[PDB]
Structure 1
């Protein structure tokens, strides 16, 4: 049947485009998630908008492998990265932007300790996390 070989060509072409983007370092693929940056360092609200404009979301690692991918991008551009999570009303508790409680974490030892005054989360270039105010300039990393 012509349908499946049409699917074959389509799948092949998608893999070619993703292959080119990967080879050139334009993105990193981890499982079903693709991470990318525009190289800009801006505040949390600005990153959120940049990602959504491109049809994605501000990146958030939910597994060690995802964490290491974002860390490698932070390291490449030598700047910390704002992540897609924010502090609950209760200090020390963080949620994803959809409202769910954060599960996987990788806090730098002692963090989070902003006492409710640091509602955002940055990833240091070693991949560990720190709660931080949301107005700093951080590398914009999106997930798709």
Structure 2
């Protein structure tokens, strides 16, 4: 159509308007094709996971420096550590994303991970570096869509 193309413009325009409003007001962060957001709650790993999937997203996990920095700023903003979408329950010391694939990008705080098999989750410090941790602490719920 010709009508299809102007309908698409309008749709794309309106999308960027809503994204713009949410962005301007700090409701979320856009990094490439990824949108990060938090409900401000501090809960444990399993709770965060459910909150995120209930909203149609997933517990956030950084796969690039820019994505890592985005999540870091939210952690900084809320002054709380953040549980990341990765665990090493399956095999010890081998952290994997929740789809089962092995993590590639890492930003471990020097010396980490250590403490080992008692600590199967990953938390992000407010400077963006990571620490392996037990999964029952109260951490800021950050989701990716």
Q: TM-score normalised by the shorter chain: which range applies?
A: over 0.9
TM-score (norm 2): 0.98
CA deviations over 1:93-118 (Å, ceiling 9, x no partner): 10000000000000000000122110
Residues 90 and 116 of structure 1 are in contact (CA less than 8 Å); yes or no, is this contact kept in structure 2? no
Secondary structure of the equivalent of 2:35?
Answer: strand
Q: For 1:107 and 1:80, how far apart are their aligned partners in 2?
A: 14
Q: Which runs of no fewer than 5 residues in structure 1 stay unpaired? A: none
Unmatched 5+ residue regions in structure 2? Answer: none
CA drift of 1:88 comes to 4.2
SS in 2 for 1:5: helix
Q: For 2:112 and 2:102, locate their aligned partners in 1 and report how far apart those are by CA, in whole Å.
A: 17
Deviation string for 1:66-102 (max 9, x for gaps)?
0000000000000000000001443221000000000
**C-alpha distance in structure 2 between counterparts of 1:119 and 1:80, whole Å:** 16
Query: 3-state DSSP class of the match of 2:75?
Result: helix
1:3-48 per-residue CA deviation (whole Å, 9 max, x = no partner) reads 0000000000000000000000000000000000000000000000
More displaced 10-residue stretch of structure 1: 108-117 or 54-63: 108-117
Distance 2:90 2:99 in 1: 15
What's the CA shift for 1:139?
A: 0.1
- For 2:122 and 2:22, the matched residues in 1 are separated by 28
